[PDB]
């Protein structure tokens, strides 16, 4: 090979050594998990929870839209009803060994009950323990949507909210009323 090529190669090797040393004399870019907590954005798609309304009841009306919107089919729930007539899930289970954390169920929820939270630490020893039942999902507060209540919009009458007491609803008028 050419001697000029050898000199240029030696110069660029010296430059590589010097710039790697300068990188060594630079500041570290390491986020020290778990001593330094990982910053997650508020809309990060991690562990799935079920939330509650401002009134404290569970927000899920067991409408089965999240389960059908799931492209993996890892949501299973059954609808039950109380004496006053409100709908709730009898059970609600999610196979987290199957969930791809895509957020389509949160997007499909018409009550903002199911939510994906900034939490990624979900490792497990047995795959049977990755099936999260309703007691592992329902949290004590509203989560990312702090004030939405579906039952304040629904026309279906429940406890504490009679007919005509929802938003943008007039009081019921009997057909036997004297007014024309």
């Amino acid at each position: 090979m050419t001697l000029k090529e050898l000199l240029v190669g030696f110069g660029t090797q010296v430059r590589s050594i010097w710039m790697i040393g300068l990188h060594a004399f630079a500041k570290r870019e390491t986020r020290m998990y778990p001593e330094e907590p990982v910053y997650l954005p508020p809309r990060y798609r991690g562990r799935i929870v079920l939330t509650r309304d401002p009134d404290g009841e569970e927000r899920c009306v067991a409408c089965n839209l999240c389960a059908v919107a799931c492209p993996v089919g890892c949501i299973s729930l059954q609808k039950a009803e109380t004496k006053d007539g409100r709908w709730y899930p009898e059970f609600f289970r999610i196979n987290f060994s199957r969930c791809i954390f895509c957020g389509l169920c949160e997007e499909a929820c018409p009550t903002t009950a199911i939510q994906l939270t900034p939490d990624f630490e979900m490792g497990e020893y047995k795959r049977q323990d990755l099936v999260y039942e309703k007691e592992d999902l329902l949290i004590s507060g509203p989560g990312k949507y702090p004030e939405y209540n579906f039952y304040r919009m629904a026309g279906m009458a429940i406890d504490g909210k009679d007919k005509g007491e929802a938003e943008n609803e007039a009081k019921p008028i009997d057909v036997k009323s004297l007014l024309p």
Partner: protein, 226 residues
Amino acid sequence: ATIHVDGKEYEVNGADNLLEACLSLGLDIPYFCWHPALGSVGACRQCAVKQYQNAEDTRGRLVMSCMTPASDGTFISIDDEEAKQFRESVVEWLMTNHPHDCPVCEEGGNCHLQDMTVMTGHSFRRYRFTKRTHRNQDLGPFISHEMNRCIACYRCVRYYKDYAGGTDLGVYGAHDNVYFGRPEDGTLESEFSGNLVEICPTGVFTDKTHSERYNRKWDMQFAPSI
């Protein structure tokens, strides 16, 4: 008979009305008040098509396809702009008072009103006023009643009285306070009152025995049985 829908010629039965003739051809016309077993009354005003007098005609006239016979040499249009606008407007008028109830309603995923709201293309609400509200009745152990979801399509009264011969279900009230149900709380006495859950295009009449353990139609495993 010879009809021309959207410029395409079709051979139909002349004794049929235009709605059932066009639905038999695979064409899609929204409809609420008409049923194949109950006949045409022209109530819901949803099935509007635009009829022309002859082959060369640009004005036309919005006619009711369930109330219009499919005579020989008919000229109609379904995808006409005025017809589509009026069908979307009829859906919008029905949706002014409809309760925000689809998650907690047993007709969800099985609702003719949902299908025709989507099919007309109406998804934007400009109505800002209140919605009328109705109290419910106890109709017995089989039929669950929710009068808020009614669109006043008169299918229930027509089937139950004119077809099934029942005497305890009727229409009451007036202008926009029309109430479909029994004169008082009680069990529906007819032996064919269960067909109301399929006759009703909304969730007013629902299968209560199904409602006890409810699941949506897409979640069912079905079989053809006897």
